[model samples]
Target: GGVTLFVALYDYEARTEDDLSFHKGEKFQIVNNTEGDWWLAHSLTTGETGYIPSNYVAPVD
Candidate 1:
């Protein structure tokens, strides 16, 4: 019923796309209740985040 959110993989690309990327410790939202296995989340770098696949996310590292 809500969006699935998370952090970013890197800072370079995130910034290039937008000067306001999510950064390394910022929280975001994601909604997978539709098509596309991934989402282009927004960061502190730009307007929105890139399409990040569900397979790339994890509870731990």
Candidate 2:
């Protein structure tokens, strides 16, 4: 429902099943950020939803 995207600042591999993987420069759709340190988002590359590390992405305005 959005083009509200975030840019990946670093590469990451999920250690948990509920986590998502992303590479630098890739974009994401963040669904929630209430968790503070981590965000609930989906990978635009894989179209998968999961937990993403906060600092790894920079929100787009």
Candidate 3:
């Protein structure tokens, strides 16, 4: 019911207000993955919060 682990597959640029940027191999948490093409996530690496491409991240155990 909390954060889910995910790892960035590649570098992503924020193309819009709903986009979130992330570097390759970076680890983060998906705070919300309920809707849309982008999912709300938080990265501890940069202390950032934004929407990330659902295809850009893969769930991690």
Compare the candidates by lDDT and give the number of the best one.
2
Quick one: ranking by TM-score, best first?
A: 3, 2, 1
Q: Show the lowest summed lDDT stretch of 10 residues, model 3.
A: 28-37
Model 1 scores a C-alpha lDDT of: 0.44
Per-residue CA lDDT of model 3 for 3-57, tens digit only, reads 5689999999898986777898887888887887688888979878888988888
When summed lDDT is taken over every stretch of 10 residues in candidate 2, the lowest stretch is: 1-10
Clashes of 3: 0
**In candidate 2, which residue pairs get closer than 3 Å at backbone N, Cα or C atoms, i.e. clash?**
none
Full-model lDDT for every candidate? 0.44, 0.87, 0.84
Clashes, model 1: 22
TM-score of each model, in listed order: 0.34, 0.82, 0.83
Where in model 3 is the C-alpha error above 4 Å? 1-3
For model 2, the superposed segments whose C-alpha errors exceed 4 Å read 1-3
lDDT of candidate 2 over 1-61, digit per residue (tens):
5567898999999899888888998888888888788898987788988998988988776
Q: What is the per-residue lDDT of model 1 for residues 1-61, given as tens digits with 9 covering 90 to 100?
A: 4444565444332324423334444544553326666554454344454554444443222
lDDT of 2 at 25: 85
